[PDB]
Amino acid sequence: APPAVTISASYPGADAKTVQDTVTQVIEQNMNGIDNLMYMSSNSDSTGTVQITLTFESGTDADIAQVQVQNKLQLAMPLLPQEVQQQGVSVEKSSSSFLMVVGVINTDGTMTQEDISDYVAANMKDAISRTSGVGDVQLFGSQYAMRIWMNPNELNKFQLTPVDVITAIKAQNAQVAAGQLGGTPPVKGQQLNASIIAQTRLTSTEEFGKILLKVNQDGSRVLLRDVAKIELGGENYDIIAEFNGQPASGLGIKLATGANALDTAAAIRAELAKMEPFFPSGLKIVYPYDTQGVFMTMVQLPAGATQERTQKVLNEVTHYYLTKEKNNVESVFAVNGFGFAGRGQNTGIAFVSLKDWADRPGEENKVEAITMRATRAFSQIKDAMVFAFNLTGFDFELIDQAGLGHEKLTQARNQLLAEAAKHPDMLTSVRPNGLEDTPQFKIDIDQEKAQALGVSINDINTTLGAAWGGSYVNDFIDRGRVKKVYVMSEAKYRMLPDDIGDWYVRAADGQMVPFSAFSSSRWEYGSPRLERYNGLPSMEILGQAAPGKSTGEAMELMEQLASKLPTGVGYDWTGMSY
Template identity: 50%
Template sequence: MLSRIFIDRPIFAWVIAIIIMLGGIGAIYTLPVEQFPDIAPPQVNIRATYPGANAQTLENSVAQVIEQQLTGIDGLLYFTTSSSSRGQVTIAATFSKGTDPDIAQVQVQNKVQQAISRLPQQVQQQGLTVTKSNPDFLLIAAIYDTTDKTTNQDVSDYLVSNLQDTIGRIKGVGDINVFGAQYAMRIWLDPNRLASFSLIPADVTTAIQAQNAEVAAGEIGGVPNTPEQVLNATVTSQSRLSTPEQFRNIVLKTQTDGSTVRLSDVGRIELGAESYAVTSRVNGHPGAGIAVSLAPGADALGTAELVKAEIERSSKAFPNGYAYSFPQDSTAFIKLSVEEVEKTLFEAIILVVIVMFVFLQNWRATLIPTIAVPVVLLGTFGVFALAGFSINTLTLFGLVLAIGLLVDDAIVVVENVERLLEENPEMSPRDATIQSMNEITVALIAIALVLSAVFLPMAFFGGSTGVIYRQFSITIVSAMVLSVVVALVLTPALTATLLKRKGDEKKDGWFARKTQRAKDWFNNGFDRTIDRYGHAVEKVIDRKWL
């Protein structure tokens, strides 16, 4: 008999229980916390920018070119495309549930690379980004100027320059989206003056690209050189242009008389906003925002805390008057939902313990199933880690439902040992435990198999619905299996050491004496209820026509 090993070696049983609990405690600190399991299929986003293009141009010259390449990708269900008049196009590729987001991103990236050569030159210069993230925003952080001394472009440029890349590198962040426009060099061309110099906008673009570039000028005195050469010098040339004055001096054309046409002759140059389509304000102050999307499978609460901590750290270097806030934060509702379920879980544990004490009427007998509760619950969290689950409302709800079931096995063991001690007053608790386990071991295993047979099939449902049922099913089944393990390993060791002979129980302390009157009152009432129920059943049997 398996239980005999642990009855003779109770320390060994405790060691196994402690190992189970330590595994669960370690899993709690590593499991992600979220409101619901990750039921949304993985999504990979492709973003491209075509300055000055309208939505129709983006659709014809960018979106269709990329869409034609998105074939032969494993697990791809569908993709959606959105183009805006601001020159931005986004393609969201959705994959079947269970697809590895990293593999999906690599495959999409490879397909995009094949399409780059067919895209307009301006799109290639801006670059394409391929990211994997959930479609919904985790939170939105806003930066604003409480003094109203700066513009929303000033705040946006500061956010992009100092926070965008830092937040994007935080663990768990899948994608970021900035609400606002940073600084850009704006060149407003005068069509009449262009025509007077026989120029077109393409000539201006070509001149800017040619003269606003980094050039490797080489060095003087480098090898091979003459023996007399003892020094060498690196030649540095003018870097990329950065001020309006430098852009104004760009030469567009040389006239036949030797005069030059500069950019300032055909237009107005100023440092303005990258886009004037958006004006962002926060609490009535000029500001900008940054939206953070969660990476697939990341810890929502942990990622949000890291983002907030990084913004808090960066706020120490904010310009005077700059402040931050979080207009949207989905983690607040996640915390509230999880806390409510955790509260229900603890309430269920307390109620189960009270009910057990009311019916067992022995603190020693009540303590044994009570000890099984934390062992099984913590062990179930360890199963979560092995199965790749998270701590969410569904898994916690499964634990709430399993509370009443997981103590059943321990109660069966205790009740059977109590019965044997009642029928055999001279029998020791150890002998009663051994005989009890010989009688009910098969029954305990059968109970676990029957309950598992009820809930286990739900674990094989497919699709997003299957994700919900799978977490609920595995939670209950794993709790039931661990309950049987505890009933076969730890509970027999506890009954053999904690329970007493019926004759010795009268020597218990003042608590047993103080509660004796309440026990008698409950037992008498319960016996009367049983008698009434028995008489009612007899009447129904005698009157079968009812």
């Protein structure tokens, strides 16, 4: 198969367009001078995430492709936002599918899903990641960060802002290089040499809680716990897993292009065996997907669907396997927020493991018949593509060739789909592979009013972003491991449009100014996922030949339909169709 190298980066709190236009385009523009590149594709998401896939000619040395990519990326790194560089960009040379899933549960319910995910991130993931043959490790959960959950009524009460919180955290959770006593070059007759130790990183919520934000006129003390709740919690909250309905975390492991599957899997088990003896009580490893005896189930809801609606669908899927398929199915490991296609609130995946082959006698209890019955049983779930598959048609990109923009490319897409519908004799299931635009909240900062009041735009924007999107401030040490600190609004002050008006920003003259005084807002539509293909805006269309027709005939018709689209809209074939 043609080797693929993948770049991943992230920008916490950024929308798809922001990601695209400060990250994705910049990287793409700088992917020159790389040998044997067939094509390039990318997603920029409203999760703050970009994924760029570079697919090389068959035969290419995947080590060389990776290195040449990494090198070009390194030279583009200074062009990306500070916020993105500091998340750490990854470059990977792996299969798009999983080799195995390591599951982790706590049989004594002493640990929640969130504790288990941190345990895994903090104690297991790195050693698994440095095992040879391990191309990509996905945590089904998040590592803990120190979370500072800000309250805007309390901040306004003491005339503070997220800017003051952030500043104070950098100043008081600091690791200072302070030299030595009797350091070199020394005076003659010096008897004492000793390191000077000054501030050191904080290690606990108690410590963060006593960060001193300010001393008032009466000499009383405003501490950080006076304006914030302080707790360990995930760096993000997007991915939640379950194993047979019980709280779980895990690692989804993908094989490095060209490594050996069997040997890689053995070396993974050897490393886990080194870890088990030091597990806290209750923690246990389960093995829910080893690459037949296994299959997956994909859950894809339309964009706009929350975690709660995706969970409802996963539960129906899990319930079906744990009741209607009891006799064939040993386990289900279900992940809400990660899907076959990557990552979102509207997607999920279920890894299913079967009982021993010998105890599923009969044609009708083998993988093929099971996956078929399940797809059948899930085919009538509402507003959800749900299907079961082990691990055919055509793959078309519609392309913006003349700076037309997202909205126009959408109309041109729809015009092609509407014509493809009128040839059901030749084409079936012609459909976008991506996502539909959804409601978004457009807020316009009034530059004139901000200037008249003496409110700085950087304070406005840091206030908005930090509170509603979260900000990575700096690092701390949690049980001797380096981890992140995040400031963000407590949930309840960032839920509804009217909450915007409870956030205050301090003006140059000391007055507190509500966000309502210098902003205005409306609802509009935009994209939760912007797609690009060889550096240009694009929209991926899937489809197949109708029954009794050749892929080639179908493709021929798609090319004809495509020649009738508005000026500036081209296309190409990719993937299976190249």
